Amino acid sequence: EVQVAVAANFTAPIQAIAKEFEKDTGHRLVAAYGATGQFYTQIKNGAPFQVFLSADDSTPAKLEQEGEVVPGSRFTYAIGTLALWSPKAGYVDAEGEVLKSGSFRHLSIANPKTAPYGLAATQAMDKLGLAATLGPKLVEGQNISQAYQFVSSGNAELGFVALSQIYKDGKVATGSAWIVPTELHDPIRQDAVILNKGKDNAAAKALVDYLKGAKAAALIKSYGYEL
Ligand code: MOO
Ligand SMILES: [N+]
């Protein structure tokens, strides 16, 4: 009986971790998907969420500075990666030269004010020196999922997506990708946290002990995350 707030980049991963979770603990994971900032606002307004799996480390810590976090519950459950991606296999090269020289008019990022992966996109465009040239071409999704769908659907020619959305057991499994090297943005450290309303919930404690387990660790590394 555990309400879980899940940043959009971890939509697929948690649905999968929850099948084995239910079968192993008897507790059912009911999760909501969206942007980290949106969940921040909802949690501050009394949303019933009990566990918050963030796409950052900063916002769970911010909720702890604001008294919404069980102290001692904050841990890192996943480290993500940003990838320039397009379903079209010809378009996005393996050094990502298209950012510098492409002919594309639409570039999908996540709302960088609410979506950690969107902030990583803006950071990498900053340190690449392509902020002024790429800014006008940007288009924002409410969350990283919507930014990926803008490309998948055809409303943009490429976008900065979460590696979890294009990654196999080892490999990018679809389209054309450029692994954004980590030197260009802050590492995408994703912190989990138990909220005020999970202080003595057994489904919450069971879930965060299982997110540190072996079944969940093997699934989180199947999606391209590191630990
Ligand atoms: O997973 Mo996010 O918070 O939508 O970038
Ligand atoms: N194509």
Side-chain angles (χ1 to χ4, degrees):
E1 197 225 329
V2 59
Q3 316 295 319
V4 188
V6 189
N9 80 95
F10 206 82
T11 303
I14 199 55
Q15 292 167 345
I17 262 94
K19 273 178 293 175
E20 301 307 323
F21 187 59
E22 215 275 303
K23 187 188 202 171
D24 293 3
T25 71
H27 297 274
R28 289 61 53 165
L29 192 158
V30 168
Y33 312 113
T36 293
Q38 293 302 339
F39 279 130
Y40 169 79
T41 287
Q42 297 170 7
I43 290 159
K44 185 218 183 290
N45 276 336
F49 297 126
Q50 315 193 7
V51 174
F52 179 25
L53 307 198
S54 185
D56 61 24
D57 61 3
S58 51
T59 306
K62 199 144 96 91
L63 280 173
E64 183 152 27
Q65 324 185 125
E66 296 180 327
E68 304 279 351
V69 170
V70 175
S73 63
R74 221 207 293 161
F75 72 102
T76 303
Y77 73 100
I79 306 189
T81 297
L82 192 65
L84 199 80
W85 180 81
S86 169
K88 293 150 57 172
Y91 198 61
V92 166
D93 71 297
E95 283 188 289
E97 279 294 345
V98 186
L99 276 190
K100 289 79 139 162
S101 57
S103 76
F104 68 87
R105 251 188 183 108
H106 293 280
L107 192 146
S108 187
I109 58 138
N111 196 317
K113 296 185 165 161
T114 57
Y117 280 73
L119 184 76
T122 63
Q123 288 173 354
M125 291 184 289
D126 269 20
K127 304 201 182 56
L128 281 170
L130 310 172
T133 188
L134 299 172
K137 311 175 144 181
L138 298 180
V139 314
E140 297 173 12
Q142 195 174 64
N143 45 64
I144 197 62
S145 283
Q146 194 182 125
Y148 165 85
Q149 286 156 18
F150 287 166
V151 190
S152 172
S153 67
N155 300 275
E157 294 106 313
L158 62 80
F160 287 96
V161 306
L163 183 63
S164 64
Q165 303 165 329
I166 56 169
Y167 186 94
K168 206 107 87 314
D169 311 308
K171 190 222 179 194
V172 167
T174 173
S176 62
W178 175 58
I179 305 300
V180 172
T182 310
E183 72 260 351
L184 303 163
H185 60 72
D186 295 356
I188 303 158
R189 179 181 295 273
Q190 319 207 141
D191 284 22
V193 73
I194 290 172
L195 301 166
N196 272 1
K197 310 189 175 195
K199 173 68 188 73
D200 296 300
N201 182 263
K205 174 58 167 167
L207 166 64
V208 282
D209 285 333
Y210 192 82
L211 287 165
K212 304 166 191 158
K215 298 271 95 176
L219 269 171
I220 289 165
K221 287 207 274 173
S222 102
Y223 270 111
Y225 299 96
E226 305 181 0
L227 306 158

